[PDB]
Every structure is written in structure tokens, then in C-alpha cells.
Amino acid sequence: HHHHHENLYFQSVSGETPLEIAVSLGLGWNLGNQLDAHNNGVADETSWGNAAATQALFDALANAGFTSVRIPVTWLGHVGEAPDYTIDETYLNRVAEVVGYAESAGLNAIINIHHDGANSQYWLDIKDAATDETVNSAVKAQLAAMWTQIANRFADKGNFLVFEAMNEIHDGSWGWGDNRTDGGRQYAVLNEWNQVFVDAVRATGGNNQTRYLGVPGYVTNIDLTVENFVLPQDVVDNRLMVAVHFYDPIDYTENADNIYSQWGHTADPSLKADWGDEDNVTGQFAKMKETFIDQGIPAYIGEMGCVHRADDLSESFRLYYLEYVCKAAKDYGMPPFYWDAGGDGTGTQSWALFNHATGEMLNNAQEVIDVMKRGIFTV
Ligand SMILES: [Cl-]
Ligand SMILES: [Cl-]
Ligand SMILES: [Mg+2]
Ligand SMILES: [Mg+2]
Ligand SMILES: [Mg+2]
Ligand SMILES: [Mg+2]
């Protein structure tokens, strides 16, 4: 019995133990294909199928019963040259607008560095940082300078606001590259980068000294995280959370080849992926519980989800999958954040639950939201 009263007032992340931190984060949602979107080398919020995000969206998320929103942010084309790596002020203001929508609606919020790290193809380059100390130093300098500016811009915000160091770091091969054969250097470099982020945020002082921060393992993969992640040193206890992503089995959840329409024990074998059923969900989450949660280290599932099926029978399996994964997340100590890429809600690969500009629910989103809420908020 370590729990304590929450003698505060405004919405916030809170708690010292993994399970209490998870309660405060509740059920999450990602503002996807939004501030993460980029085109022609520059972040471009409206270029990947969404109109600009609004307060109306965040009010709708809160009314629907979400607790927290992850706001992926791509900064490409909005950061100056070394040594200052100055962030364009208007873009930073836009990030602050979206954070403010979440704050106003009584939601927790996570902001990050997102597609700057995509595939090691831009400045945030693990492949070359692991072989060239000059590159590693430049990456760290940019990471520290950017996070100093972001932290300073949000220094007045309370603990509703979380900073997540970066997104999905890999050398191009998505976890099956030189990270497997190089003796551990890439894993060590990512751990160093997370330490640089923590140090830079904490050095700004004030509220940033005690803010909850998210730090990922390699390619946000559960196995590579439990095997190789090292928790950074910190000046305060219990304010670093391990970030993982979970889409298993991606062939089903994203429906790439439009052939796997069922999932789990009752699925027809000819209509399902050949792996990744219920035992994979609990088996993977058990690794996170054994390595982190049970050792006092909080963790969260920064992205999860499953695309819509227009067919009634297939959609039943999608709702079952989402309900099963959310209930397992609750049982194993991690808040899940659903991946909502928005768009128009048509086609065979739609993640959208809300129109990102009007806040209106799309198609059967209410039923999807209800099953996810049942996993998190119902015993
Ligand atoms: Cl109690
Ligand atoms: Cl499996
Ligand atoms: Mg073009
Ligand atoms: Mg500035
Ligand atoms: Mg390069
Ligand atoms: Mg040198």
C-alpha cells in the first residue's frame, strides 16, 4: 500500500508506482497524420488527409471518455542550423495551440519528436551515429538544443503535459538490421540519446524538473526494449516511463494485403494471420510487466489499434481485438494510446474514429470507443 491522496486540482499525470501512473493516463488517443505529417521536406499538418486540428476535436475526445492524447510532432523543415538548431517560432506556437486544446479539454498530453527519426533517413540518424562519433555528437547536440527550446516553451505547464524523447528509432531495417549484429552499439547509442533528452529537459528547471517523460526502446519493439533498454539516470524518482508500440499482428491490424479479416481463437484459419493471437498479447505484455512494471518502472503503449472493416462479421473481430488488447494493457500495467490517422474514414485501411477538425465521430466509432473504455475503466 504505497498509494497516496491526490491533493491537487487540475488534470495531471500523477503517481509514484506504475499502476497509479497508468490510472492517471487512462485511455489514450493519437492525433495521427497531423503534426507528424510532412511533405517536400517540411512538416505540413494538412498534407496527409486531415484538416487542421481544433479545440472542437479535443472537446469531443474528452466527451467520448478519453483521458490522454499523444500529439506526434515532426519538426523537419522547421529547425535551423548548428549550433543553435533554432525552432521556427510559429511552428512551436502551433504545437502550443494543440497542447492548449488538450489542456482546455481536461486531457493529459504527450508531445514528441516524430518523423525526424523516420528510418534513420534524416538528422536523427542512429545508423551513422553508431559508427561515427562526429555524427553521434551532432545528433545529441540537436536533440539537446531542440528539447531545451521545447521544454522552455512549456515551462509553465503542469504535469498534464508529458515529453516523449523520440518515436521509432531504427537503422532502416526496422529491427532486423545491424542492431542485431553490431555487438550492441546501436542499442547503446539510443540509450545515450534518451539520457541526453532527460538531462536537457531537467536542466531547464522549474516544472520541467518533475515532469513525467517518455523514453523508447529500439523501434518501440517490446522484445528489443526489454532486452536492451536502460533506464536513464534522473534527478527525481519515478518520472521516466518506457514507451513501446504494439500492433501485433500488423498484417491483421493494418490490413495491408486485404486478406486477414479475422483474429483470435474463433477466427477461420483461412482468414487470419498465422501468428499474433491472444497468447501473443498476454505473452508480450507479460514481458513488459516482468521487466518494468513489477520493478517499479512505469511503461505505456504509445501506439496500438486496428483498422475498420465495413463487413459486419469482420468488424466484430476488430472490436474483439481492441477490447482484448485494452483489457490486457490494463491488466499488465500500461495505458494504451489508439492510433488515429484520421482521413475520410473510407477504404480498407482506415484508423479514423473522429474527423480531426470537426470532432465528429465517424462510422461506428462509438462502439469501438465503448469497447476500449470497458477494458480500461471496467473491472
Ligand atoms: Cl489504497
Ligand atoms: Cl504468436
Ligand atoms: Mg512532391
Ligand atoms: Mg524561440
Ligand atoms: Mg543520412
Ligand atoms: Mg572529431
XYZ file of N, CA, C and O in Angstrom, residues 213-359:
588
model
N 8.265 11.990 -18.230
C 8.874 11.899 -19.544
C 8.768 10.471 -20.061
O 8.842 9.509 -19.284
N 8.616 10.336 -21.382
C 8.623 9.040 -22.044
C 9.930 8.829 -22.795
O 10.429 9.745 -23.445
N 10.459 7.614 -22.706
C 11.708 7.235 -23.364
C 11.528 5.876 -24.027
O 11.089 4.926 -23.364
N 11.857 5.738 -25.322
C 11.601 4.474 -26.009
C 12.800 3.543 -26.070
O 13.960 3.944 -25.941
N 12.500 2.268 -26.333
C 13.482 1.312 -26.777
C 13.530 1.240 -28.291
O 12.802 1.928 -29.011
N 14.405 0.366 -28.780
C 14.687 0.297 -30.207
C 13.440 -0.085 -30.990
O 12.762 -1.067 -30.659
N 13.139 0.734 -32.006
C 11.977 0.635 -32.892
C 10.677 0.408 -32.133
O 9.706 -0.104 -32.690
N 10.608 0.886 -30.888
C 9.459 0.699 -29.991
C 9.001 -0.758 -29.916
O 7.824 -1.042 -29.658
N 9.925 -1.688 -30.087
C 9.600 -3.110 -30.086
C 9.718 -3.679 -28.677
O 10.727 -3.477 -28.006
N 8.688 -4.389 -28.219
C 8.712 -4.889 -26.842
C 9.944 -5.754 -26.567
O 10.621 -5.581 -25.543
N 10.255 -6.703 -27.449
C 11.375 -7.596 -27.163
C 12.698 -6.840 -27.125
O 13.527 -7.052 -26.227
N 12.939 -5.973 -28.102
C 14.202 -5.243 -28.110
C 14.301 -4.261 -26.953
O 15.413 -3.926 -26.516
N 13.156 -3.779 -26.469
C 13.124 -2.887 -25.312
C 13.452 -3.657 -24.033
O 14.372 -3.292 -23.287
N 12.737 -4.749 -23.757
C 13.043 -5.464 -22.519
C 14.477 -5.986 -22.522
O 15.114 -6.073 -21.464
N 15.012 -6.351 -23.690
C 16.360 -6.907 -23.738
C 17.453 -5.851 -23.651
O 18.521 -6.132 -23.087
N 17.241 -4.657 -24.184
C 18.338 -3.719 -24.391
C 18.129 -2.329 -23.823
O 19.114 -1.578 -23.718
N 16.913 -1.930 -23.479
C 16.677 -0.601 -22.923
C 17.337 -0.475 -21.556
O 17.300 -1.404 -20.746
N 17.914 0.695 -21.296
C 18.470 1.045 -19.996
C 17.783 2.322 -19.529
O 17.791 3.328 -20.238
N 17.199 2.288 -18.350
C 16.516 3.468 -17.831
C 17.530 4.575 -17.580
O 18.527 4.337 -16.901
N 17.311 5.784 -18.096
C 18.252 6.874 -17.826
C 18.319 7.191 -16.345
O 17.354 6.970 -15.595
N 19.457 7.750 -15.938
C 19.565 8.379 -14.628
C 18.741 9.659 -14.606
O 18.589 10.343 -15.619
N 18.194 9.987 -13.443
C 17.328 11.148 -13.306
C 17.568 11.790 -11.950
O 18.124 11.179 -11.037
N 17.174 13.063 -11.852
C 17.321 13.837 -10.622
C 16.128 13.699 -9.685
O 16.164 14.224 -8.561
N 15.064 13.044 -10.124
C 13.851 12.791 -9.369
C 13.514 11.333 -9.629
O 13.942 10.750 -10.624
N 12.769 10.725 -8.717
C 12.374 9.337 -8.902
C 11.019 9.236 -9.597
O 10.162 10.114 -9.479
N 10.828 8.135 -10.312
C 9.507 7.732 -10.805
C 8.893 8.714 -11.791
O 7.667 8.864 -11.823
N 9.720 9.349 -12.622
C 9.211 10.287 -13.613
C 9.659 9.934 -15.022
O 9.519 10.771 -15.925
N 10.175 8.727 -15.241
C 10.525 8.240 -16.567
C 9.687 7.012 -16.878
O 9.648 6.061 -16.089
N 9.033 7.029 -18.041
C 8.138 5.957 -18.464
C 8.664 5.343 -19.755
O 9.024 6.077 -20.683
N 8.715 4.018 -19.814
C 9.180 3.317 -21.010
C 8.062 3.291 -22.041
O 6.959 2.809 -21.768
N 8.351 3.779 -23.240
C 7.388 3.810 -24.331
C 7.604 2.626 -25.261
O 8.719 2.418 -25.734
N 6.528 1.868 -25.548
C 6.543 0.827 -26.571
C 5.343 1.033 -27.488
O 4.367 1.686 -27.132
N 5.411 0.435 -28.675
C 4.275 0.395 -29.594
C 3.884 -1.059 -29.808
O 4.734 -1.956 -29.750
N 2.593 -1.299 -30.055
C 2.096 -2.666 -30.155
C 0.983 -2.745 -31.186
O -0.140 -2.308 -30.914
N 1.288 -3.350 -32.325
C 0.330 -3.561 -33.400
C 0.199 -5.040 -33.757
O -0.422 -5.381 -34.778
N 0.755 -5.938 -32.952
C 0.829 -7.329 -33.373
C -0.570 -7.920 -33.531
O -1.402 -7.762 -32.632
N -0.850 -8.664 -34.611
C -0.023 -8.875 -35.809
C -0.343 -7.784 -36.830
O -1.523 -7.627 -37.201
N 0.666 -7.038 -37.286
C 0.414 -5.888 -38.147
C -0.305 -6.272 -39.430
O -1.077 -5.470 -39.973
N -0.075 -7.475 -39.960
C -0.801 -7.850 -41.167
C -2.307 -7.793 -40.948
O -3.053 -7.468 -41.880
N -2.767 -8.113 -39.740
C -4.187 -8.014 -39.404
C -4.579 -6.577 -39.039
O -5.565 -6.030 -39.557
N -3.816 -5.937 -38.156
C -4.279 -4.665 -37.615
C -4.253 -3.549 -38.648
O -5.093 -2.648 -38.573
N -3.321 -3.566 -39.601
C -3.316 -2.571 -40.661
C -3.899 -3.099 -41.971
O -4.173 -2.305 -42.875
N -4.091 -4.405 -42.099
C -4.839 -4.984 -43.222
C -4.188 -4.684 -44.573
O -4.876 -4.395 -45.553
N -2.858 -4.783 -44.643
C -2.136 -4.339 -45.835
C -2.654 -5.012 -47.103
O -3.072 -4.336 -48.051
N -2.613 -6.340 -47.153
C -2.974 -7.070 -48.364
C -4.450 -7.457 -48.413
O -4.840 -8.246 -49.279
N -5.268 -6.910 -47.514
C -6.718 -7.112 -47.505
C -7.096 -8.590 -47.613
O -7.991 -8.974 -48.369
N -6.419 -9.425 -46.830
C -6.693 -10.851 -46.820
C -7.009 -11.402 -45.428
O -7.624 -12.471 -45.338
N -6.601 -10.734 -44.355
C -6.810 -11.247 -42.998
C -7.913 -10.420 -42.354
O -7.680 -9.290 -41.922
N -9.107 -11.002 -42.261
C -10.278 -10.297 -41.765
C -10.741 -10.772 -40.394
O -11.692 -10.202 -39.853
N -10.105 -11.791 -39.821
C -10.500 -12.338 -38.523
C -9.270 -12.523 -37.643
O -8.131 -12.516 -38.121
N -9.510 -12.659 -36.337
C -8.446 -12.706 -35.348
C -8.908 -13.488 -34.129
O -10.086 -13.464 -33.770
N -7.972 -14.177 -33.491
C -8.232 -14.815 -32.219
C -8.736 -16.238 -32.333
O -8.787 -16.838 -33.405
N -9.154 -16.773 -31.183
C -9.452 -18.198 -31.080
C -10.553 -18.638 -32.034
O -10.560 -19.798 -32.467
N -11.530 -17.780 -32.303
C -12.677 -18.194 -33.102
C -12.484 -17.946 -34.592
O -13.355 -18.317 -35.384
N -11.363 -17.359 -34.989
C -11.159 -16.998 -36.382
C -11.047 -18.221 -37.275
O -10.476 -19.242 -36.893
N -11.576 -18.095 -38.478
C -11.369 -19.112 -39.504
C -9.895 -19.124 -39.881
O -9.332 -18.061 -40.175
N -9.229 -20.287 -39.876
C -7.786 -20.290 -40.166
C -7.434 -19.714 -41.523
O -6.313 -19.229 -41.708
N -8.359 -19.754 -42.480
C -8.091 -19.239 -43.817
C -8.270 -17.729 -43.919
O -8.026 -17.171 -44.997
N -8.686 -17.063 -42.836
C -8.967 -15.632 -42.856
C -8.169 -14.866 -41.810
O -8.496 -13.712 -41.513
N -7.134 -15.476 -41.246
C -6.368 -14.853 -40.173
C -4.876 -14.967 -40.448
O -4.427 -15.835 -41.199
N -4.109 -14.075 -39.824
C -2.657 -14.190 -39.843
C -2.235 -15.462 -39.114
O -2.985 -16.021 -38.308
N -1.017 -15.925 -39.394
C -0.566 -17.200 -38.849
C 0.082 -17.067 -37.476
O 0.673 -18.039 -36.988
N -0.037 -15.906 -36.835
C 0.520 -15.698 -35.506
C -0.234 -14.543 -34.866
O -1.115 -13.931 -35.476
N 0.108 -14.249 -33.617
C -0.296 -12.994 -33.010
C -1.664 -12.964 -32.367
O -2.263 -11.888 -32.269
N -2.171 -14.111 -31.925
C -3.478 -14.183 -31.270
C -3.377 -13.844 -29.789
O -2.424 -13.174 -29.371
N -4.369 -14.256 -29.003
C -4.487 -13.785 -27.628
C -3.234 -14.049 -26.809
O -2.845 -13.214 -25.979
N -2.614 -15.221 -27.003
C -1.438 -15.586 -26.223
C -0.248 -14.689 -26.539
O 0.646 -14.529 -25.695
N -0.191 -14.114 -27.744
C 0.857 -13.146 -28.039
C 0.626 -11.839 -27.289
O 1.583 -11.213 -26.811
N -0.627 -11.394 -27.191
C -0.912 -10.174 -26.446
C -0.458 -10.320 -25.001
O 0.298 -9.495 -24.469
N -0.930 -11.367 -24.330
C -0.570 -11.531 -22.925
C 0.900 -11.896 -22.766
O 1.551 -11.450 -21.809
N 1.455 -12.679 -23.692
C 2.861 -13.022 -23.592
C 3.773 -11.821 -23.723
O 4.759 -11.680 -22.990
N 3.475 -10.940 -24.675
C 4.287 -9.744 -24.857
C 4.096 -8.778 -23.702
O 5.069 -8.184 -23.217
N 2.854 -8.572 -23.266
C 2.644 -7.639 -22.164
C 3.237 -8.192 -20.863
O 3.681 -7.409 -20.005
N 3.276 -9.529 -20.709
C 3.913 -10.129 -19.539
C 5.394 -9.790 -19.481
O 5.955 -9.642 -18.384
N 6.056 -9.673 -20.637
C 7.469 -9.285 -20.631
C 7.629 -7.877 -20.087
O 8.537 -7.604 -19.290
N 6.749 -6.966 -20.507
C 6.802 -5.600 -20.004
C 6.517 -5.554 -18.508
O 7.148 -4.784 -17.767
N 5.571 -6.377 -18.040
C 5.244 -6.386 -16.619
C 6.407 -6.927 -15.795
O 6.730 -6.379 -14.737
N 7.053 -7.993 -16.270
C 8.149 -8.604 -15.522
C 9.377 -7.703 -15.488
O 10.049 -7.596 -14.453
N 9.695 -7.051 -16.611
C 10.924 -6.284 -16.706
C 10.777 -4.887 -16.123
O 11.722 -4.372 -15.512
N 9.618 -4.250 -16.314
C 9.426 -2.854 -15.925
C 8.414 -2.698 -14.799
O 8.786 -2.279 -13.695
N 7.150 -3.045 -15.037
C 6.083 -2.724 -14.091
C 6.389 -3.284 -12.709
O 6.307 -2.572 -11.699
N 6.725 -4.573 -12.646
C 6.973 -5.234 -11.371
C 8.256 -4.761 -10.714
O 8.472 -5.058 -9.537
N 9.122 -4.072 -11.450
C 10.337 -3.486 -10.906
C 10.163 -2.008 -10.585
O 11.148 -1.317 -10.314
N 8.935 -1.511 -10.615
C 8.657 -0.140 -10.245
C 8.834 0.866 -11.354
O 8.813 2.078 -11.080
N 9.016 0.415 -12.584
C 9.257 1.303 -13.717
C 7.968 1.395 -14.531
O 7.507 0.366 -15.048
N 7.378 2.577 -14.677
C 6.157 2.699 -15.485
C 6.452 2.538 -16.965
O 7.572 2.754 -17.428
N 5.408 2.174 -17.709
C 5.517 1.987 -19.147
C 4.167 2.258 -19.781
O 3.123 2.064 -19.155
N 4.187 2.669 -21.053
C 2.950 2.936 -21.767
C 3.054 2.442 -23.197
O 4.135 2.307 -23.761
N 1.892 2.158 -23.774
C 1.775 1.696 -25.157
C 1.386 2.934 -25.960
O 0.213 3.314 -26.052
N 2.393 3.601 -26.515
C 2.193 4.873 -27.179
C 1.410 4.788 -28.472
O 0.864 5.807 -28.910
N 1.375 3.608 -29.104
C 0.552 3.368 -30.279
C 0.081 1.916 -30.257
O 0.876 1.006 -29.985
N -1.195 1.717 -30.598
C -1.835 0.416 -30.792
C -3.076 0.700 -31.642
O -3.422 1.864 -31.875
N -3.748 -0.342 -32.127
C -5.004 -0.135 -32.818
C -5.267 -1.202 -33.862
O -4.542 -2.188 -33.975
N -6.335 -0.979 -34.638
C -6.761 -1.924 -35.661
C -7.711 -1.180 -36.584
O -8.605 -0.478 -36.100
N -7.540 -1.354 -37.901
C -8.348 -0.618 -38.865
C -9.765 -1.186 -38.958
O -10.045 -2.351 -38.663
N -10.671 -0.327 -39.404
C -12.086 -0.617 -39.599
C -12.315 -1.573 -40.757
O -11.630 -1.530 -41.782
N -13.318 -2.427 -40.584
C -13.846 -3.268 -41.650
C -15.310 -2.908 -41.889
O -16.094 -2.817 -40.940
N -15.675 -2.704 -43.154
C -17.056 -2.372 -43.478
C -17.985 -3.572 -43.341
O -19.188 -3.387 -43.127
N -17.445 -4.784 -43.441
C -18.230 -6.001 -43.297
C -18.566 -6.260 -41.830
O -17.683 -6.232 -40.968
N -19.843 -6.556 -41.556
C -20.316 -6.729 -40.185
C -19.546 -7.826 -39.454
O -19.142 -7.659 -38.297
N -19.379 -8.983 -40.089
C -18.726 -10.096 -39.412
C -17.278 -9.762 -39.101
O -16.803 -9.978 -37.980
N -16.556 -9.236 -40.088
C -15.162 -8.868 -39.862
C -15.031 -7.807 -38.772
O -14.107 -7.866 -37.947
N -15.943 -6.823 -38.748
C -15.829 -5.752 -37.759
C -15.964 -6.293 -36.337
O -15.347 -5.763 -35.408
N -16.768 -7.342 -36.145
C -16.872 -7.954 -34.827
C -15.497 -8.351 -34.305
O -15.179 -8.136 -33.132
N -14.671 -8.945 -35.168
C -13.335 -9.360 -34.765
C -12.451 -8.174 -34.414
O -11.619 -8.273 -33.506
N -12.593 -7.058 -35.140
C -11.822 -5.862 -34.826
C -12.159 -5.342 -33.434
O -11.271 -4.972 -32.655
N -13.451 -5.282 -33.103
C -13.844 -4.804 -31.784
C -13.361 -5.752 -30.703
O -12.918 -5.317 -29.640
N -13.444 -7.064 -30.957
C -12.901 -8.038 -30.015
C -11.404 -7.825 -29.804
O -10.937 -7.786 -28.663
N -10.646 -7.686 -30.891
C -9.215 -7.426 -30.781
C -8.942 -6.200 -29.916
O -8.117 -6.242 -28.991
N -9.606 -5.079 -30.207
C -9.339 -3.851 -29.467
C -9.734 -3.980 -28.012
O -9.017 -3.502 -27.124
N -10.868 -4.626 -27.742
C -11.288 -4.847 -26.363
C -10.289 -5.742 -25.644
O -9.898 -5.465 -24.498
N -9.838 -6.806 -26.311
C -8.895 -7.731 -25.693
C -7.571 -7.044 -25.374
O -7.001 -7.229 -24.281
N -7.056 -6.253 -26.311
C -5.775 -5.595 -26.111
C -5.879 -4.527 -25.030
O -4.964 -4.373 -24.218
N -6.976 -3.762 -25.004
C -7.105 -2.734 -23.971
C -7.240 -3.347 -22.580
O -6.658 -2.834 -21.614
N -7.997 -4.437 -22.458
C -8.118 -5.106 -21.167
C -6.779 -5.686 -20.723
O -6.420 -5.597 -19.540
N -6.013 -6.260 -21.653
C -4.694 -6.771 -21.314
C -3.761 -5.639 -20.920
O -2.977 -5.775 -19.967
N -3.821 -4.510 -21.626
C -2.999 -3.369 -21.244
C -3.279 -2.970 -19.797
O -2.352 -2.778 -18.995
N -4.554 -2.852 -19.437
C -4.912 -2.535 -18.057
C -4.360 -3.583 -17.099
O -3.773 -3.250 -16.057
N -4.559 -4.862 -17.422
C -4.130 -5.934 -16.528
C -2.619 -5.979 -16.336
O -2.144 -6.458 -15.296
N -1.847 -5.550 -17.332
C -0.389 -5.639 -17.300
C 0.270 -4.294 -17.026
O 1.499 -4.178 -17.144
N -0.507 -3.262 -16.699
C 0.045 -2.047 -16.127
C 0.396 -0.922 -17.066
O 1.136 -0.017 -16.663
N -0.129 -0.909 -18.293
C 0.273 0.078 -19.295
C -0.934 0.788 -19.895
O -1.884 0.120 -20.329
N -0.948 2.117 -19.949
C -2.033 2.811 -20.664
C -1.849 2.677 -22.164
O -0.747 2.898 -22.670
N -2.915 2.316 -22.903
C -2.819 2.220 -24.364
C -3.312 3.480 -25.051
O -4.313 4.078 -24.631
N -2.627 3.867 -26.138
C -2.983 5.025 -26.956
C -3.331 4.542 -28.360
O -2.457 4.072 -29.098
N -4.600 4.666 -28.726
C -5.086 4.231 -30.031
C -4.533 5.128 -31.136
O -4.496 6.352 -30.995
N -4.113 4.519 -32.250
C -3.559 5.263 -33.383
C -4.670 5.722 -34.325
O -5.257 4.908 -35.046
N -4.923 7.029 -34.363
C -5.981 7.600 -35.207
C -5.338 8.496 -36.270
O -5.044 9.674 -36.037
N -5.157 7.944 -37.475
C -4.563 8.682 -38.579
C -5.567 9.592 -39.268
O -5.197 10.294 -40.198
N -6.833 9.587 -38.851
C -7.799 10.482 -39.463
C -8.045 10.115 -40.909
O -8.161 8.937 -41.277
N -8.130 11.140 -41.745
C -8.603 10.926 -43.096
C -10.120 10.964 -43.153
O -10.792 11.469 -42.249
N -10.666 10.398 -44.231
C -12.102 10.477 -44.501
C -12.872 9.235 -44.076
O -14.080 9.157 -44.325
N -12.215 8.267 -43.447
C -12.905 7.087 -42.978
C -13.416 6.168 -44.060
O -14.334 5.386 -43.804
N -12.861 6.243 -45.266
C -13.212 5.327 -46.339
C -12.076 4.343 -46.572
O -10.967 4.500 -46.056
N -12.362 3.312 -47.349
C -11.348 2.361 -47.733
C -11.178 1.253 -46.719
O -11.937 1.113 -45.752
N -10.145 0.450 -46.956
C -9.921 -0.778 -46.211
C -8.815 -0.657 -45.174
O -8.450 -1.664 -44.556
N -8.267 0.541 -44.971
C -7.180 0.723 -44.017
C -7.394 1.986 -43.198
O -6.450 2.749 -42.951
N -8.631 2.240 -42.777
C -8.955 3.460 -42.055
C -8.863 3.240 -40.550
O -9.562 2.382 -39.989
N -8.020 4.042 -39.903
C -7.889 4.072 -38.460
C -8.806 5.103 -37.817
O -8.870 5.183 -36.592
N -9.504 5.916 -38.608
C -10.151 7.103 -38.066
C -11.352 6.758 -37.194
O -12.234 5.988 -37.603
N -11.416 7.383 -36.033
C -12.600 7.399 -35.180
C -13.287 8.753 -35.182
O -14.515 8.810 -35.033
N -12.522 9.837 -35.351
C -13.060 11.184 -35.381
C -12.526 11.924 -36.600
O -11.374 11.716 -37.014
N -13.336 12.828 -37.142
C -12.797 13.860 -38.020
C -11.923 14.782 -37.167
O -12.372 15.301 -36.138
N -10.651 14.966 -37.568
C -9.693 15.669 -36.732
C -9.951 17.168 -36.649
O -9.353 17.833 -35.796
N -10.814 17.707 -37.502
C -11.138 19.122 -37.471
C -12.506 19.414 -36.876
O -12.659 20.396 -36.138
N -13.528 18.609 -37.175
C -14.852 18.874 -36.615
C -15.084 18.156 -35.295
O -15.977 18.549 -34.540
N -14.335 17.104 -35.013
C -14.566 16.304 -33.835
C -15.714 15.324 -33.932
O -15.988 14.614 -32.956
